[PDB]
Amino acid sequence: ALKVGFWPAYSVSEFPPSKINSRLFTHLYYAFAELNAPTFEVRVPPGSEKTAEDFTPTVRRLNPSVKTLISIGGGGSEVRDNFAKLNSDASARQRFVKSSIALARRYGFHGLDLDYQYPEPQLEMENFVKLVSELTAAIREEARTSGKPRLLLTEAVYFHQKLFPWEVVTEYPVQFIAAGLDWVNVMAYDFHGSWENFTGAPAALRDFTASVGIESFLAAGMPPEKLVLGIPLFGRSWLLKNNNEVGIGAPAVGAGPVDGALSFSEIQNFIRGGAREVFDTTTVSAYAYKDNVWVGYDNQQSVALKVQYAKEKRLGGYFFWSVNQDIDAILPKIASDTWG
Ligand SMILES: CC(=O)N[C@@H]1[C@@H](O)[C@H](O[C@@H]2O[C@H](CO)[C@@H](O[C@@H]3O[C@H](CO)[C@@H](O)[C@H](O)[C@H]3NC(C)=O)[C@H](O)[C@H]2NC(C)=O)[C@@H](CO)O[C@H]1O
């Protein structure tokens, strides 16, 4: 039962690794090492070496059994462009593979993650397959030469097995992934948000839903234990067109605070300051509103329902993005209690 959380290094001054309740997790990710084009000597951002080294000993103090991975890349156009340049150059792929493995060992991580959004179109998937195949082989070779258990290898995936469901240009090769990786982190969120003119459930379990995306990976043949269901610790926000239309599907005029996203902890403050929370059974989600601000998110009820869903679907577990955004670890606690 994988209970996974991502800790973003940007948050260090407000939420250092020491604040993570690592009792509630089996695996915790450092986000992110950088690709460091053009040499592709993968590294943590210069200046953050101490933070990266101390991460694993720190989180293990509260739960020695917890393991860690370092995630390389992250969402965003610069990372995507760097992976696309990397994956087309055999020499660069070799430098990336060697340096990534060395990085994980250097800082005491138990594994590596790729976060690449996204390996599309078809050329980019084909080249990503070359990178990942080479990385899997080198991980096995390093275990052989060091005598240590092999590094874990995971990657972030889009919510759906097809890139993209409305216009398929490529798709994740599930048998390849199952053979090469320990699991994938299914990004079952950002379905709805301020790019749209109406409020919606940004991580709806059902209704662009988490269950349809999960179904697509299973139908393609992914072993269910290789899927880890993502659950956001942030909400997507809108400004309402009219303060008396406050439900799902209400008209909106742009992004709410802060640039369209609010941490769970900020949402708790929003509710304590007078916003009304509503559970939406139709989507398995929550929303809250006050005056012209509306936010959709996951709450204690929807998280328990999503985690039970993952269990019923025989998934490997769940992950949170990102742990600094529930400072009191409310949602990680209910998730852990739900699974058992
Ligand atoms: C052809 C068409 O209209 N397609 C629609 C899709 O574009 C839309 O996908 C969503 O698009 C938005 C905006 O590009 C994505 O939001 C971004 O997501 C990233 C990563 O999750 C996040 O870091 C950004 O902050 C966020 N940007 C903003 C402005 O919030 C979102 O991920 C896309 N979601 C999915 C599931 O692809 C979908 C779904 O709304 O609808 C199609 O009709």
- Residue 238 · residue 197 · CB < 8 Å: no
State how far the Cα of 258 lies from the Cα of 275, in Å rounded to an integer: 16
Mapped to the 3 state alphabet, what secondary structure does 303-318 carry? HHHHHHHHHHCCCCEE
Residue nearest to atom 5 of ligand 1 (CA): 166
Handedness of CA 236, 3, 160, 151 (dihedral sign): positive
Do 77 and 211 belong to one domain? yes
State how far the Cα of 277 lies from the Cα of 287, in Å rounded to an integer: 6
Do 267 and 320 belong to one domain? no
State how far the Cα of 126 lies from the Cα of 108, in Å rounded to an integer: 31
Do 125 and 227 belong to one domain? yes
Question: Separation of 9 CA from ligand 1 center, angstroms?
Answer: 24
State how far the Cα of 96 lies from the Cα of 102, in Å rounded to an integer: 10
Residue nearest to atom 10 of ligand 1 (CA): 191
Q: What are phi and psi of 67, to 5 degrees?
A: -115, 165
Would you list the DSSP string of 6-69?
EEEGGGTTTS-GGGS-GGG-SEEEEEEEB--TTTT--B--TT-HHHHHHHHHHHHTT-TT-EEE
Domain end marker among 262, 282, 297 = 297
- Residue 295 · residue 267 · CB < 8 Å: yes
| Structure tokens, 53 | 């080294």
Do 173 and 278 belong to one domain? no
> Which of 190, 197, 236 has the most ligand 1 atoms within 8 A of CB, as the residue to mutate?
190
Q: How many CA atoms lie within 13 A of 303 on its CB side?
A: 28
CATH number reported for the structural domain that contains residue 111 in this entry: 3.20.20.80
Resolution stated for this PDB structure, in Å? 1.3
Do 227 and 240 belong to one domain? no
Neighbours of 291 (CB within 10 A): 11
Is any atom of ligand 1 closer than 6 Å to the C-beta of 166?
yes
- Residue 313 · residue 300 · CB < 8 Å: no
Range of the domain at 303: 1-232+298-340
Torsion of CA 309, 313, 315, 321, to 10 degrees: -30
Is any atom of ligand 1 closer than 6 Å to the C-beta of 93?
no
The contacts of residue 281 (CB under 8 Å, 6+ apart) are none
- Residue 302 · residue 285 · CB < 8 Å: yes
State how far the Cα of 156 lies from the Cα of 64, in Å rounded to an integer: 25
Relative to beta strand 276-280, strand 183-186 is: unpaired
Residue nearest to atom 3 of ligand 1 (CA): 166
Three-state SS at 157: strand
Question: Separation of 191 CA from ligand 1 center, angstroms?
Answer: 6
Q: Is the peptide bond before 121 cis (omega within 30 degrees of 0)?
A: yes
- Residue 332 · residue 323 · CB < 8 Å: yes
Q: Domain total for the chain? A: 2
Q: Could you identify the atom of ligand 1 that is nearest to the CA of residue 160?
A: 36
Q: What are phi and psi of 326, to 5 degrees?
A: -125, 85
Do 137 and 62 belong to one domain? yes
